[PDB]
Amino acid sequence: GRDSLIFLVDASKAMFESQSEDELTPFDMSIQCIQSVYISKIISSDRDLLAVVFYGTEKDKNSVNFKNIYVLQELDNPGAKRILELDQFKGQQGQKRFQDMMGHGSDYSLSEVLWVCANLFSDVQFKMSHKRIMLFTNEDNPHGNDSAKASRARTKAGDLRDTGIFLDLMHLKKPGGFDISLFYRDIISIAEDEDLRVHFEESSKLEDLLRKVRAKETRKRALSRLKLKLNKDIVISVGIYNLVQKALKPPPIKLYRETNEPVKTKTRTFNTSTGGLLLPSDTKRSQIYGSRQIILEKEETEELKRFDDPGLMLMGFKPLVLLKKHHYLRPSLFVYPEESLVIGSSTLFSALLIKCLEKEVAALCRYTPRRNIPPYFVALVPQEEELDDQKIQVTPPGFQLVFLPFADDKRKMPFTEKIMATPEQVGKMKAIVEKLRFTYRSDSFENPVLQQHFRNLEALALDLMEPEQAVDLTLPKVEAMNKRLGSLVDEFKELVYPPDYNPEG
Amino acid sequence: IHWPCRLTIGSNLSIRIAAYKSILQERVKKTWTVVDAKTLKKEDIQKETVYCLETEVLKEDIIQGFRYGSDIVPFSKVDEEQMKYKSEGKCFSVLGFCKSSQVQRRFFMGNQVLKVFAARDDEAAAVALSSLIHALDDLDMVAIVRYAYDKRANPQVGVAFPHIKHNYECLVYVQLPFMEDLRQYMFSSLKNSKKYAPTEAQLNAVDALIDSMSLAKKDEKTDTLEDLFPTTKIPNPRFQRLFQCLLHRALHPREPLPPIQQHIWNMLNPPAEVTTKSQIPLSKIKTLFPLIEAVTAQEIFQDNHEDGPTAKKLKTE
């Protein structure tokens, strides 16, 4: 299902207070972090719910009527209006407006705020994959002092942990250290050791929290629950996935030129010869070759496209060397064992994966994704699991499905034949390549079009005078390449290109 | 169609290049011309898109819009163009060199492969290209390259690796994915397989099958593997079946279309000798592995041929 996260914000005095009273306050930096989180959720997955609440203030808004604890927004999809009203209290003067229309001066109750947020999570009508809470404060001793409320809040937090609430706290700016292990580190939802000292740090993860990452992050869904058939009856369930997937601009929305409300449309078929409405059964497809207009219906047209039922038809074993890497049809997919229909599928999958890794032969198979689709020829190469230093799966175990192009998957090609080059020029190119040797990383790039699109949409949402400008990761470092290389380009140009000739059309 | 361009390495190196589509997901250039079911006149058939809420709306009363998460942003295509990031026409530059093993076929974006030469009959460009080819081949480096087809085509990130052939030398371009174009999906450790650890005899039978199901051959004792079932010099039979049906319907405007032909299966069927070899280990593994499984074949009313009343030569009362 979805996920729930609530940002709980202190308001007593420290949020407005700053270490030097000239930089971001623990108040406004929380504003910025929440704005960034809103943007990231809008870009990635709005279906998750986000809530923001203030405690320690002089008023309250919770339905449960607990004083000093003011709720701002419910657990809900990130709305731009939430961001606007949030920025209304952003900056050292935004918190001035906060202190104008609101204030503080009354002690909060962690037990009460935990009660309130537990109710808020109870208000969710959707499957929450996780129940995360975001806390914005820098002190614990306000409740670490009175042991009554302290133990009360500890009990309540234990209850929340029983409920599966993933409580979290943020190292926040304080001129006296974050001050944990005093009233915290014994009450937080924690299962790993990160830091339990009195660290004078002001941030633990505000850095990447403010980091604006713009991507979709589709949840894991089985692209297909296929059934690999070996000969005719030895069939196993297999999960097919697209670990690589082209991202696309969100679909345009039809809406007024006058009020901009969404407009649904409707396309209908009319008898151009009559104006009368045309039935879906009232027309037939055709193709005209020569003097013959071959007329056909639709169902027959799809059936003549169907050759095999959906699934994988094992064509045999072919050595990995017999596969032309320069031959490529369309992006490859991943195949994992699936044991939900055919029991024992994963055991056989392990056996065949090990055997293929040993013998180093891929499984060529006839592929039918779904019905009314001509089967293709696909090579399943045994791709093994790989783990990082953290042992986190960087490569899954299973197979990689690569399309094998047919004869008719190429185009005619007029060209000139092979032309040699001197070994001196080859050595010069080796030196130049080694000069500009850079490490490849799959995530070193983004679509500048998409990035600028996100920035434009954001600026539209926030009604900015101007949008953010997208940095380009695809730019060649022409000045830097020339600086790194030197006159090697001139040397090789004189080596091959005669000084009279300039490469030009 | 030829794509002229210049292989730009920095601001000082330019090589006139000849780009060509080598591999592609080919498709017929004739969509089904749907016509009338009565007079077979596609002209009399026409679509009528209409906008409304009734409360009808016109094409000239609507704009382009988008959904901003839980929000809706009206954003006309004019505004989209003005704030659009725009690339450069036909521009194609290299970004750097990286190890070949840094990239795998898993990152092979696009649905086409571009075999690229230097510009036709530019000897200096050709010699420079071949020198780059040899240098990269010996260094095992591949060139990360930025590509733009034209002014209105979005920029793409891909890599070019040299294809070595005695008759011609090309850089093979395949697009590469952004971090936006990736899926980070975890999968269980099949190596830590306690409940799916196959028996050794099963593994041996599997290996015996693969030996008996291997689709290659040792040629001339030269260890040059000989494939028995290429499928790369074999055309897609879908268009063959299409033409079969088209021809039948043209000759027989009333007869039902013929079924798939047996030679079509044969060109799809791997060598039957491999099948005969595999026959025995197939049954062996079938016995060896326990596998257990956890709507539209709409026929006529009659699974039989005929029925009805008939009582001829019978009037015995």
């Binding site: 997955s45 790993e192 929290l209 992050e217 490490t439 990383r441 995530d443 070193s444 990761l473 | -």
Partner: peptide, 23 residues
Amino acid sequence: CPGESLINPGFKSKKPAGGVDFD
């Protein structure tokens, strides 16, 4: 948890967009 995105629980940690830099 190691190798997990803070913003999206259950999603792998998001590395910076980075770029090209020769070595």
